[PDB]
Write an enzyme that holds these catalytic residues in place. Structure first.
Site, mmCIF file in Angstrom:
data_model
loop_
_atom_site.group_PDB
_atom_site.id
_atom_site.type_symbol
_atom_site.label_atom_id
_atom_site.label_comp_id
_atom_site.label_asym_id
_atom_site.label_seq_id
_atom_site.Cartn_x
_atom_site.Cartn_y
_atom_site.Cartn_z
ATOM 1 N N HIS A 1 1.497 1.304 -5.854
ATOM 2 C CA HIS A 1 0.068 0.856 -5.839
ATOM 3 C C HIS A 1 -0.610 2.016 -6.135
ATOM 4 C CE1 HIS A 1 -3.430 -1.158 -4.711
ATOM 5 N NE2 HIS A 1 -3.876 -0.107 -3.795
ATOM 6 N N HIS B 1 0.887 -1.168 -0.128
ATOM 7 C CA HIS B 1 -0.011 -0.128 -0.112
ATOM 8 C C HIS B 1 0.828 1.053 0.148
ATOM 9 C CE1 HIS B 1 -2.560 -3.094 1.646
ATOM 10 N NE2 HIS B 1 -3.492 -2.538 0.969
ATOM 11 N N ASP C 1 -5.223 5.539 -0.769
ATOM 12 C CA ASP C 1 -4.596 4.931 -0.021
ATOM 13 C C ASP C 1 -3.583 5.566 0.670
ATOM 14 O OD1 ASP C 1 -6.017 2.228 0.311
ATOM 15 O OD2 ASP C 1 -4.552 1.249 -1.105
ATOM 16 N N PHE D 1 -8.383 -16.231 -3.494
ATOM 17 C CA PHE D 1 -9.229 -14.977 -3.559
ATOM 18 C C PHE D 1 -9.461 -14.554 -4.959
ATOM 19 C CE2 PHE D 1 -8.048 -10.156 -3.800
ATOM 20 C CZ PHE D 1 -8.860 -9.725 -2.563
HETATM 21 C C1 1GF Z 1 -10.212 -10.616 4.816
HETATM 22 O O1 1GF Z 1 -10.740 -10.681 3.775
HETATM 23 C C2 1GF Z 1 -9.588 -10.709 2.820
HETATM 24 C C3 1GF Z 1 -9.158 -12.052 2.548
HETATM 25 O O2 1GF Z 1 -9.657 -13.078 3.278
HETATM 26 C C4 1GF Z 1 -9.029 -14.306 3.201
HETATM 27 C C5 1GF Z 1 -9.485 -15.045 2.089
HETATM 28 C C6 1GF Z 1 -8.542 -15.886 1.363
HETATM 29 C C7 1GF Z 1 -8.986 -16.339 0.047
HETATM 30 C C8 1GF Z 1 -10.220 -16.400 -0.182
HETATM 31 F F1 1GF Z 1 -10.922 -17.127 -1.342
HETATM 32 C C9 1GF Z 1 -11.200 -15.508 0.408
HETATM 33 C C10 1GF Z 1 -10.970 -14.866 1.481
HETATM 34 C C11 1GF Z 1 -7.833 -12.182 1.584
HETATM 35 C C12 1GF Z 1 -7.450 -10.961 0.931
HETATM 36 O O3 1GF Z 1 -6.415 -11.278 0.005
HETATM 37 C C13 1GF Z 1 -5.860 -10.235 -0.757
HETATM 38 C C14 1GF Z 1 -4.603 -10.821 -1.505
HETATM 39 C C15 1GF Z 1 -4.461 -9.753 -2.498
HETATM 40 C C16 1GF Z 1 -4.841 -8.561 -2.313
HETATM 41 C C17 1GF Z 1 -5.698 -8.111 -1.378
HETATM 42 O O4 1GF Z 1 -5.555 -6.721 -0.984
HETATM 43 C C18 1GF Z 1 -6.880 -6.045 -1.756
HETATM 44 C C19 1GF Z 1 -6.424 -4.883 -2.989
HETATM 45 C C20 1GF Z 1 -5.994 -3.859 -2.796
HETATM 46 C C21 1GF Z 1 -5.622 -3.136 -1.667
HETATM 47 O O5 1GF Z 1 -5.678 -3.712 -0.228
HETATM 48 O O6 1GF Z 1 -5.328 -1.835 -1.673
HETATM 49 C C22 1GF Z 1 -6.221 -8.904 -0.526
HETATM 50 C C23 1GF Z 1 -7.281 -8.763 0.497
HETATM 51 O O7 1GF Z 1 -7.704 -7.431 0.862
HETATM 52 C C24 1GF Z 1 -7.956 -9.832 1.107
HETATM 53 C C25 1GF Z 1 -9.274 -9.835 2.091
HETATM 54 C C26 1GF Z 1 -9.918 -8.265 2.170
HETATM 55 C C27 1GF Z 1 -10.491 -7.855 0.860
HETATM 56 C C28 1GF Z 1 -11.759 -8.314 0.369
HETATM 57 C C29 1GF Z 1 -12.211 -7.641 -1.035
HETATM 58 C C30 1GF Z 1 -12.766 -8.978 1.385
HETATM 59 C C31 1GF Z 1 -3.913 -7.580 -3.082
HETATM 60 C C32 1GF Z 1 -3.246 -7.939 -4.145
HETATM 61 C C33 1GF Z 1 -3.027 -9.464 -4.500
HETATM 62 C C34 1GF Z 1 -4.119 -9.793 -5.555
HETATM 63 C C35 1GF Z 1 -1.749 -9.803 -4.958
HETATM 64 O O8 1GF Z 1 -3.556 -10.080 -3.335
HETATM 65 MG MG MG Z 2 -7.533 0.833 0.776
HETATM 66 ZN ZN ZN Z 3 -5.820 0.163 -2.592
#
Ligand code: 1GF
Ligand code: MG
Ligand code: ZN
EC number: 3.1.4.53
Length: 325
Positions: A79, A75, A116, A287
């Site tokens: 980004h 972040h 951000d 994810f």
């Molecule tokens: C707690 O919920 C979760 C979560 O749970 C565990 C989980 C595991 C498997 C699943 F299938 C479901 C849930 C897993 C998450 O894994 C991530 C992976 C990421 C990125 C993420 O950041 C968001 C992007 C931009 C920013 O933060 O600025 C996240 C999350 O934010 C994220 C969240 C929150 C986001 C929701 C929409 C709900 C960014 C870059 C890349 C793509 C490389 O990989």
């Molecule tokens: Mg954000």
């Molecule tokens: Zn962001």
């Protein structure tokens, strides 16, 4: 210099999905947000349209870029630059040609740039669970996203930083509201609700006589821009793999560092944050299957077929990560 012509050459890709944003960070001397914002403002003629003095734009952009943390792996200002440039391309899509005013384009791109700023590299839930000053200030509600907006707007008040000085009062008022609406929508806990409204708009889609998407009202307009910046925020897995892989590396370092703080404090470790029980590949696949593809598939339907190549890359990259387990 010659190094600035190498950068000028790379900045010709600013209209293309999958710009090599890390390279532009190198060639710009860690200034991707500034040069990509400046390039985009030029390209859309926004400096002339909104009488933005070029030196005020650069001063604000550098101060903004400065208030991203360089010691946070994901972040950060890169980004930020990436989300700005991705939103810019998404604004350009045919199904949206001439849909949004110059003010709405300006709000979307500004929102993306500040969206951000001053992120400490931990989550809202971590900030709530640790009784942080941030969480106390914002009453556990959109804690980070409120803070990004507050910092982003407050920097307009620094010396020669008010890039909106020549907007009318009502333009400033409209833009402020739209930007707040946009950035508050990037709160990850709103994704399900955001996607539900996007589905509904896809299911009741209306196009005009020019085959272009029809939005009668502020609610529909702001909601498309909210999902647009949310998609751009979650666009790493839609990019060429050599980019996507570095974003994975960076988010996992951030997540692992948060987990080490959670562990030290006796807390339960957050999803994906435990370096001793991680599964980076299966998590990316998970994810994508549950969050990123359902989102981008719905966006792709809204602007069909404009987004077909982006969705195909997403599907290939999901296949690739799958094949490594
Ligand atoms: C707690 O919920 C979760 C979560 O749970 C565990 C989980 C595991 C498997 C699943 F299938 C479901 C849930 C897993 C998450 O894994 C991530 C992976 C990421 C990125 C993420 O950041 C968001 C992007 C931009 C920013 O933060 O600025 C996240 C999350 O934010 C994220 C969240 C929150 C986001 C929701 C929409 C709900 C960014 C870059 C890349 C793509 C490389 O990989
Ligand atoms: Mg954000
Ligand atoms: Zn962001």
């Amino acid at each position: 210099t010659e190094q600035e012509d190498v950068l000028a050459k790379e900045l010709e890709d600013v209209n293309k999905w999958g710009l090599h944003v890390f390279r532009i960070a190198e060639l710009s001397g860690n200034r991707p947000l500034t040069v990509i914002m400046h390039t985009i403002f030029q390209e859309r003629d926004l400096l002339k349209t909104f009488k933005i003095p070029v030196d005020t734009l650069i001063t604000y952009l550098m101060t903004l870029e400065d208030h991203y943390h360089a010691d946070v792996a994901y972040h950060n200002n890169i980004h930020a630059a990436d989300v700005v440039q991705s939103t810019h391309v998404l604004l350009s899509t045919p199904a949206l040609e001439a849909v949004f005013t110059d003010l709405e384009i300006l709000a979307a791109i500004f929102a993306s740039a500040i969206h951000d700023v001053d992120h400490p590299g931990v989550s809202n839930q971590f900030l709530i669970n640790t009784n942080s000053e941030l969480a106390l200030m914002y009453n556990d509600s959109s804690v980070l996203e409120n803070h990004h907006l507050a910092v982003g707007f407050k920097l307009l008040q620094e010396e020669n930083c008010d890039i909106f000085q020549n907007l009318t009062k009502k333009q400033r008022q409209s833009l402020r509201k739209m930007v707040i609406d946009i950035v508050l929508a990037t709160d990850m806990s709103k994704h399900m609700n955001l996607l539900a409204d996007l589905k509904t708009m896809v299911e009741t889609k209306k196009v005009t006589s020019s085959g272009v998407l029809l939005l009668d009202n502020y609610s529909d307009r702001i909601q498309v821009l909210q999902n647009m910046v949310h998609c751009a925020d979650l666009s790493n897995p839609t990019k060429p793999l050599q980019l996507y892989r570095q974003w994975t590396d960076r988010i996992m370092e951030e997540f692992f560092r948060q987990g080490d703080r959670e562990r030290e404090r006796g807390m339960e470790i957050s999803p994906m944050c435990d370096k001793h029980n991680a599964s980076v590949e299966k998590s990316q696949v998970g994810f994508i299957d549950y969050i990123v593809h359902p989102l981008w598939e719905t966006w792709a339907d809204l602007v069909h077929p404009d987004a077909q190549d982006i969705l195909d890359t997403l599907e290939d990259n999901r296949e690739w990560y799958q094949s490594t387990i």
